[PDB]
């Protein structure tokens, strides 16, 4: 399949006044050849919005460029930060506009909904653009089944930033050890309203 060519996966979880997004670091080639082990799949849109793109790497890059273009246009026009739900619906509309010539990407949106009350906000899509606003965790990629199993096994409601980091990191590492075409290091990225902590895990590079 087209998704087996490059592989890779993205994950996101929420906690108490914190929210984590995690991904692997690999650019595959012909489903078995590793050509890069730093191909980061998480991109920053604004301070309170992040996107994790998984699928075909060229479509990942084009979708990131298009979303950056639209987000920067919105911010310079309005002179304010984007709400996470607005970016979510914009991404859904952009995905559906290419209904019959799709970008082969399965994105997730992870951010803080402001009100000031920093609520977590997690959403996941497919190539068509069918959203699923999920309250605990969001999963996408070729390692989706392993990630779903690990997440329901290990998720606990209302963790702080630390326990959220160990939970999401263990989920990602255990899921990636059971996928052939995803791994070679892992980025974890824990957001809080006051700071942000990004770490590279010591993973199985094989």
């Amino acid at each position: 399949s087209i998704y087996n060519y490059n592989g890779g996966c993205v994950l996101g979880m929420s906690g108490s006044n914190c929210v984590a997004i995690a991904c692997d670091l690999r650019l595959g080639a012909n489903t078995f050849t590793t050509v890069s082990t730093k191909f980061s799949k998480i991109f920053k849109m604004n301070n309170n919005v992040y996107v994790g793109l998984s699928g075909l790497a060229t479509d990942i890059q084009t979708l990131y460029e298009i979303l950056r273009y639209r987000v920067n246009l919105y911010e310079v026009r309005q002179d304010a930060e984007m709400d996470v739900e607005c970016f979510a619906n914009m991404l859904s509309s952009i995905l559906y506009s290419n209904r019959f010539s799709p970008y082969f990407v399965n994105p997730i949106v992870v951010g803080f909904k402001l009100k000031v009350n920093y609520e977590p906000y997690l959403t996941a899509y497919d190539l068509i653009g069918a959203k699923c606003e999920t309250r605990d965790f969001v999963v996408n990629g070729v390692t989706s089944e392993q990630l779903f199993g690990m997440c329901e096994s290990l998720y606990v409601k209302d963790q702080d930033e630390n326990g959220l980091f160990e939970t999401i990191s263990q989920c990602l590492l255990s899921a990636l050890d059971r996928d052939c075409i995803s791994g070679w290091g892992a980025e974890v990225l824990v957001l809080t309203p006051e700071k942000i902590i990004k770490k590279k895990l010591k993973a199985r590079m094989d």
């Binding site: 990191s169 255990s174 059971r178």
Partner: protein
């Protein structure tokens, strides 16, 4: 006419030093439709060995009956019951005999051997097999196997706790099949858990989500 179907379900297997647990759901379903809510997948071979399997139900039932018949003939002829390793090689040969029209059945052969040591043997359709400490087959297997890999071997954890016993392992398998029915549509209804110690087999049952 395509002669293969997948009847769904899942079969989890775990070992300790001197015991083996084998859980399996009892759902049977064609495709988004339930044949019945009780179709066991685990079968008894001897007083110290069981076989569970997932795939096409007719293949599983015929294979289990044939293996039981062969083991009984073995007992009648050679005058001693076979160890789990003998039954493992026998199952390998039986599955490879149909190498060019394979059984659509993935099996886990669980037992306790001569040395009172728990042994498992996971199988594929055409008879490749190996020993394992834990294993899983069926629709849910890609969910459960990362969980078992995390809990048992604990590769990615810097500080470990390898303090396992029968009750905690039973609870762990119950949680695993609970997550399986949670995220697998083909896993559900009652589940049967077989526990083999040095004394023999003991069967427990647990209701899961009827959905």
């Amino acid at each position: 006419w395509y002669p293969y179907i997948d009847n769904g379900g899942t079969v989890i297997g775990l070992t300790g030093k001197d015991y083996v647990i084998l859980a399996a759901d009892t759902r049977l379903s064609l495709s988004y439709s339930i044949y019945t809510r009780f179709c066991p997948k685990i079968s008894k071979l001897t007083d110290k060995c069981i076989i569970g399997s997932s795939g096409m139900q007719s293949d599983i039932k015929t294979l289990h009956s044939l293996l039981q018949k062969k083991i009984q003939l073995f007992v009648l002829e050679h005058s001693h019951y076979p160890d789990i390793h003998v039954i493992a090689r026998l199952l390998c040969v039986i599955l490879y005999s149909r190498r060019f029209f394979p059984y659509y059945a993935f099996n886990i052969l669980a037992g306790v051997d001569e040395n009172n040591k728990g042994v498992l043997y996971n199988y594929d359709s055409v008879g490749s097999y190996c020993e394992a400490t834990h294993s899983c087959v069926g629709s849910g297997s890609q969910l459960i196997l990362p969980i078992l890999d995390n809990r048992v071997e604990q590769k990615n954890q810097l500080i470990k706790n390898t303090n396992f016993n029968l009750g905690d392992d039973i609870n762990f398998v119950k949680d695993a099949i609970t997550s399986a029915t949670e995220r697998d549509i083909y896993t559900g209804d009652k589940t049967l858990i077989y526990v083999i110690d040095k004394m023999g087999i003991n069967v427990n049952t647990l209701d899961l989500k009827q959905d």
